[PDB]
Design a binder for this molecule. Sequence first.
Ligand SMILES: OC[C@H]1O[C@@H](O[C@H]2[C@H](O)[C@@H](O)[C@H](O)O[C@@H]2CO)[C@H](O)[C@@H](O)[C@H]1O
Lengths: 132, 135
Amino acid sequence: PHKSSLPEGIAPGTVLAIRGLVPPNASRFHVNLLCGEEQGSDAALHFNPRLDTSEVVFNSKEQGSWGREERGPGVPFQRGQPFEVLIIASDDGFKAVVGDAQYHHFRHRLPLARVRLVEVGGDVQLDSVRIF
Amino acid sequence: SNVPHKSSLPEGIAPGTVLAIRGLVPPNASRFHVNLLCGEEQGSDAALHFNPRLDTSEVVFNSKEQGSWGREERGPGVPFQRGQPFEVLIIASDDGFKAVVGDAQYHHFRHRLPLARVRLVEVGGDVQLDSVRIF
Ligand SMILES: OC[C@H]1O[C@@H](O[C@H]2[C@H](O)[C@@H](O)[C@H](O)O[C@@H]2CO)[C@H](O)[C@@H](O)[C@H]1O
């Protein structure tokens, strides 16, 4: 599980840039923006491409319980295919950009000022992870 | 070559706006520019003038208000090469514009004009543009 600590937090204008490739037999992977380094920390954002169910799920997690799921359209990911993702923070929410096209806008549910860690988990091959 | 290139933003940009510019610096390039301007008319103020100079091996940053340029800032060396493709992000925050070149933070240009005045992106000079996208 690829971890990037952000002890000074993030603000509008933060860009998480991820490049990689969906393994040919992958089921699902996810990117979490978490509010602490401890296990079970709240998730300001959970971005969950799902190759098995042909879904992309966005959610938040508070005191261990998942919120209301949001879904983007279809699935701009393919097993065996490379991808490019941007998750961009603004004052209003997180903009998920896939393949050089705006994909979904997830409005803030928890305070952005609480985020302290980026975590990329699941079945994915990471070529590059950067926070600008 | 897709230059001169213009992207109108009549409603403006805000913190979290990302300008993504990909292209090739062609073999005999001297310099190119990315401008964030405050209107469509000629001589509009420049909130940001980003000026990679291949011929003098520097990158200049500046602003322009009422026809007058500010004091130039310079990044650390030229992260562009003649004959080489590039990817630039110009990222707006509450504090300024972050310039990212090829997967690394290159320079932070503090706002001199209010971000809320920007209404147009122009790209031109000695570059062969692949794409300009605003997220
Ligand atoms: O919603 C984020 C959270 O989802 C869990 O799976 C969902 C899924 O959409 C479906 O099986 C159904 O709605 O139930 C679950 C929510 O109760 C994942 O297991 C978890 O890791 C997160 O991705």
